[PDB]
Design a protein around this ligand. Structure first.
Ligand SMILES: Cc1c(/N=C2\O[C@@H](C(F)(F)F)[C@@H]3[C@@H](O)CCN23)ccc(C#N)c1Cl
Length: 249
């Protein structure tokens, strides 16, 4: 009352810096090494955040880390889109206060197309007039949006958790949203927005995987924790063993 939203607001991560050297000419090697470091810092925070979510400990211990790892990229993308919207009106990609991507950096990073999709996702927060509370509920739903095609250790607990988060988003749209037809229109919009995160995360995963494999050749540094997740968990996604749960299609 509103207990659920109270929680989401309480656990939302603070500012996370990349540690990028902005006082020197951009280089593909430097920019990507900084995204890798930032990526690792975010994963660390995403784990603490996820573990504090209502019902999260209902999941089996093994399912817990798997769900975090599979969902990590999408969660990062979604939160980054929001920061971009709120801080710079979606004009640039606000990865961190010390790692803001303008068009030049988007190009230099060699992930221009992926950045353009992320920029579009950020613009949608404005076009759809996403509230901070809708954003928090959607980001939590995102954690429960990608699983092994052949289920988890205890799939039932996960299914119940997902259903409960869907219900929370519902209440949130209905809180001040009059008569049904409007709630339906809004749920339709948000579910479409949520689904749109998955293809972006997939493309980012593909690029990251490719870069890791050739990392030694391009002078890109991958922290050990990243190398492990990208080589062990990410291929399960790229090979189709683990897939997103789409609302539509
Ligand atoms: C999309 C994104 C990030 N992207 C990435 O992190 C690196 C990974 F290896 F960590 F995945 C890799 C890089 O090699 C190529 C894209 N990946 C990194 C940090 C944030 C943030 N905040 C966001 Cl939104």
């Amino acid at each position: 009352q509103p207990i659920f939203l109270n929680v989401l607001e309480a656990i939302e991560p603070g500012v996370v810096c990349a540690g990028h050297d902005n006082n020197q000419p951009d280089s593909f090697a430097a920019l990507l090494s900084s995204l890798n470091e930032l990526g690792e810092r975010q994963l660390v925070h995403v784990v603490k955040w996820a573990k504090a979510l209502p019902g999260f400990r209902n999941l089996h211990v093994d399912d817990q880390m798997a769900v975090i790892q599979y969902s990590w990229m999408g969660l990062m993308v979604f939160a980054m889109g929001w920061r971009s919207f709120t801080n710079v009106n979606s004009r640039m990609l606000y990865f961190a206060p010390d790692l803001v991507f303008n068009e030049y950096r988007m190009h230099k990073s060699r992930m221009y197309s992926q950045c353009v999709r992320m920029r579009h996702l950020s613009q949608e927060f404005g076009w759809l007039q996403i509230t901070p509370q809708e954003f928090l509920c959607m980001k939590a739903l995102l954690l429960f949006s990608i699983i092994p095609v052949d289920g988890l250790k205890n799939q039932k607990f996960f299914d119940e958790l997902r259903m409960n988060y869907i219900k929370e988003l519902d209440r949130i749209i209905a809180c001040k949203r009059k008569n049904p037809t409007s709630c339906s229109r809004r749920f339709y919009q948000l579910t479409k927005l949520l689904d749109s995160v998955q293809p972006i995360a997939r493309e980012l995963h593909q690029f990251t995987f490719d870069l890791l494999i050739k990392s030694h050749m391009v002078s890109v540094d991958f922290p050990e924790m990243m190398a492990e997740i990208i080589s062990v968990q990410v291929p399960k996604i790229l090979s189709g063993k683990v897939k997103p749960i789409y609302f539509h299609t």
